[PDB]
């Protein structure tokens, strides 16, 4: 019922006069729809959904101008952080930036995001209230000052509360069956085993959208973290996503253990059991 | 739709 627009930005410095790598990708929910990439030989914002391709030369020229503005801004941000931390000319460093909105079942909701990370650590991030900043170290405390004194916070909101939502909404409409579908998990189980007095149980879940999903594992109605081999939810690459949850059990004790598949696109949670 | 305004650290 909830949705999200989010842009992800990745700037990497390249020692010795080299212009940095810059990658920008735009997601609506869990579905990438645009990318910029300094490496690639278009040097325009490229469409990566098929539903955003209908937008006219105006929008594209438009986004391109902004992404080229964003790129140059991050080339500078790199130079600046190298300065703040007194790091050297000879290291490569990484600025990551994510901003975007959340909407509700309503589509007229707000949660706003705009945060940074330098070399894998958090740097500065706009708090939930959208008027305040959280500043990691002194170096970030410098940026907090600049951005309080400049009223950056209040300028963000005009986008986060405004055009972000408006265009999120606009996209969810045109996306149609793509963006607003809720593909259900096809689920089953396995019994491969490399012992006599042990046995392995895998609770599979394939071909589901959106990505978010819950694969609990209870012994006789009590959740178990112990032995519960859970992998990151992975993309099948067709648009759906995959996730399995393993548990090792002793032989002849698999009549006890039950799976629990919660997903957004299910009528009720699907309790599961091994079958001879 | 990207943010129209950019900001420096």
């Amino acid at each position, epitope marked *: 019922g909830s949705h999200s627009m989010r842009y992800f930005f990745t700037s990497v410095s390249r020692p010795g006069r080299g212009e940095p790598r810059f990658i920008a990708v735009g997601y609506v929910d869990d579905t990438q729809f645009v990318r910029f990439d300094s490496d690639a030989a278009s040097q325009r914002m490229e469409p990566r959904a098929p539903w955003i391709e209908q937008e006219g030369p105006e929008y594209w020229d*438009g986004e391109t*101008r*902004k992404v*080229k*503005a964003h790129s*140059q*801004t991050h*080339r*500078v941000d790199l130079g600046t952080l190298r300065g703040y931390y007194n790091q050297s000319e000879a290291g490569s460093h990484t600025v990551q930036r994510m901003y975007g909105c959340d909407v509700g079942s309503d589509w007229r909701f707000l949660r706003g995001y705009h945060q940074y990370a330098y070399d894998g650590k958090d740097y500065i991030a706009l708090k939930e209230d959208l008027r305040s900043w959280t500043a990691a170290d002194m170096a970030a405390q410098t940026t907090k000052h*600049k*951005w309080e*004194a*400049a*009223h*950056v916070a*209040e*300028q*963000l909101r*005009a*986008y986060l509360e*405004g*055009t972000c939502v*408006e265009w999120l909404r606009r996209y969810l409409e045109n996306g149609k069956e793509t963006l607003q579908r809720t593909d259900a998990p096809k689920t089953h189980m396995t019994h491969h085993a490399v012992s006599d007095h042990e046995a392995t149980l895998r609770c599979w879940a394939l071909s589901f959208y959106p990505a978010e999903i819950t694969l609990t594992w209870q012994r006789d109605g009590e959740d178990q973290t112990q032995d519960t081999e859970l992998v990151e939810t992975r993309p099948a690459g067709d648009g759906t996503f995959q996730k399995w949850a393993a548990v090792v059990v002793p032989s002849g004790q698999e009549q006890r253990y039950t799976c629990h598949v919660q997903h957004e696109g299910l009528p009720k949670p699907l309790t599961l059991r091994w079958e001879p | *739709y990207l*943010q*129209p*305004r*950019t*900001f*420096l650290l």
Partner: T-cell receptor
Framework: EVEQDPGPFNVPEGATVAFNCTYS??????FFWYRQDCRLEPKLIMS???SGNEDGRFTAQLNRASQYISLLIRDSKLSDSATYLC??????????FGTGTRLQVFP | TGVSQDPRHKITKRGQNVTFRCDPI?????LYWYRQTLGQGPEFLTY????????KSRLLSDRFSAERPKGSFSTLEIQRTEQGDSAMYLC???????????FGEGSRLTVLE
């Protein structure tokens, strides 16, 4: 298009004058009042945020909803005589002036 | 401290080139070229961030070009001048975090036949 009262405001001192300005794109996130003496350059009066910006005789508000920003000079003074310029960003970082609203304060 | 332009006035003969210089406030990254004809508001020409020239308007012809080779001083250059070019050519340095323009006293170009 940044649009603002075309007609010149000729008023006597003591008077209270209100400038209206509106911007076309909802995109704009940065809003300004500049003031310009006749044969000189434009100077910043005021950055315009939602919270009632209360200078001395000057107060401006921003109505993002109706994409409209205003200015209210309380006690008109001979020295307030200048063209008052409305400025917002347009699609990018770039900053775009309205045509200006001229003020002459008689004594 | 502020933005400083040279020259303040230049009279030029129709079809001669002119070159306006601008030395801004160091700390501000962005630098803006506007142009004002008597009675209208300032028309955007082009803005830089450091050495980079992010945007320039339809209104700036072939004849008009502006460099900012380092992050610092910028030049505007009008070629084969026409009477229509006659205007105040305003240089402004600008905060990136706020959008505050800090104008010089401009260069008045009057072009005559």
């Amino acid at each position: 298009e940044v649009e603002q009262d075309p007609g010149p405001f000729n008023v006597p001192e003591g008077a209270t004058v209100a400038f209206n300005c509106t911007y076309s794109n909802s995109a704009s996130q940065s809003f300004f009042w500049y003031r310009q003496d006749c044969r000189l350059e434009p100077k910043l009066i005021m950055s315009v945020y939602s919270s009632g910006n209360e200078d001395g005789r000057f107060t401006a508000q921003l109505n993002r909803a109706s994409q409209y920003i205003s200015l209210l000079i309380r006690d008109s003074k001979l020295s307030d005589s200048a063209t008052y310029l409305c400025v917002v960003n347009i699609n990018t970082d770039k900053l775009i002036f309205g045509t200006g609203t001229r003020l002459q304060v008689f004594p | 401290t502020g933005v400083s332009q040279d020259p303040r006035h230049k009279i030029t003969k129709r079809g001669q080139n002119v070159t306006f210089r601008c030395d801004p406030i160091s700390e501000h990254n962005r630098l803006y070229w506007y142009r004002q004809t008597l009675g209208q508001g300032p028309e955007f020409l082009t803005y830089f961030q450091n050495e980079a020239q992010l945007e320039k308007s339809r209104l700036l012809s072939d004849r008009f070009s502006a460099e900012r080779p380092k992050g610092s001083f910028s030049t505007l250059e009008i070629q084969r001048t026409e009477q229509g070019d006659s205007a105040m050519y305003l240089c402004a340095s600008s905060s990136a975090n706020s959008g505050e323009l800090f104008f010089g006293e401009g260069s008045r170009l009057t072009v005559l036949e």
